[PDB]
Design a binder for this molecule. Structure first.
Ligand SMILES: Cc1cccc(CC(=O)n2ccc3c(F)c(-c4cn(C)c5ncnc(N)c45)ccc32)n1
Length: 247
């Protein structure tokens, strides 16, 4: 409706719902537009609409810039966000499979922006719940952005309690961050080596070369991956960790 009227579709970017790249006819900018099927039940609908009003207030360097939300008639909710690069963080790591291509400083600076975005959210009483490299983005200016979240794939980055449907808190994001930090610092040759190693890391089994090369990050990651959520550090403790002192 308003979508087909005010926008020219360019391509599907992903399919929780569907995300399209599309160009606004009036301002000629390209945007990522998320379309979700709105719940039929009235109470369940109001839940979604409350989440939208909360997220639309958020403004942070690590949060994708927001533009607009509207409904169209079955009802569809449309969310218009800034279009990020096609190369997400998963792609970024895929094209960089050697140590030399994963410079310590560039990697930590990437992780740090993720962690700061997460700390911002937690401080607002929100959590991300969906942190993983395929859902971490770069703007056209190369600012790191946490990806889509708010309204609820691989479970590889998902905390135990979140996988098993147990009660959970913002500590679930800390678990994800831990695995992402390791993955940032430890390139893989093959997809299968990636899965074999990551599942081991979830279980606190690390490659010796990692522990020796990154003794401090190793200890951080160990803590963030505690099976017990209470034991994981707060996002603020992580951001303040000595490992990030070289600015
Ligand atoms: C209503 C509202 C306001 C502010 C923030 C949010 C939550 C949020 O970060 N997002 C909501 C939909 C969404 C979202 F669809 C993308 C996105 C997905 N894909 C595949 C992309 N590719 C390029 N650029 C993007 N921005 C994206 C990123 C973030 C998104 N909600």
């Amino acid at each position: 409706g308003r979508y087909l009227t005010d926008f020219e579709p360019i391509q599907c970017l992903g399919r929780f719902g569907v995300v399209f790249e599309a160009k606004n006819k009036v301002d000629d900018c390209n945007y990522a537009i998320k379309r979700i099927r709105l719940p039929n039940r009235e109470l369940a609908r109001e839940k979604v609409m409350r989440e939208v009003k909360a997220l639309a207030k958020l403004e942070h360097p690590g949060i994708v810039r927001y533009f607009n939300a509207w409904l169209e008639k079955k009802v569809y909710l449309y969310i218009q966000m800034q279009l990020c690069r096609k190369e997400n963080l998963k792609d970024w790591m895929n094209g960089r499979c050697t140590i030399e291509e994963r410079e310590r400083s560039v990697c930590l600076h990437i992780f740090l922006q993720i962690a700061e975005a997460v700390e911002f959210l937690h401080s607002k009483g929100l959590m991300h719940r969906d942190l993983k490299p395929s859902n971490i983005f770069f703007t056209m200016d190369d600012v790191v952005k946490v990806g889509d979240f708010g309204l609820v794939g691989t479970k590889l980055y998902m905390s135990p309690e979140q996988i098993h449907g147990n009660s959970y808190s913002h500590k679930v994001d800390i678990f994800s961050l831990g695995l992402i930090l390791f993955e940032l610092l430890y390139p893989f040759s093959t997809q299968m080596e990636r899965v074999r190693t990551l599942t081991d890391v979830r279980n606190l089994k690390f490659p010796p070369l990692f522990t020796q090369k990154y003794p401090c990050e190793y200890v951080m990651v160990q803590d963030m991956l505690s099976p017990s959520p209470m034991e994981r550090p707060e996002a603020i403790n992580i951001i303040e960790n000595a490992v990030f002192e070289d600015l």
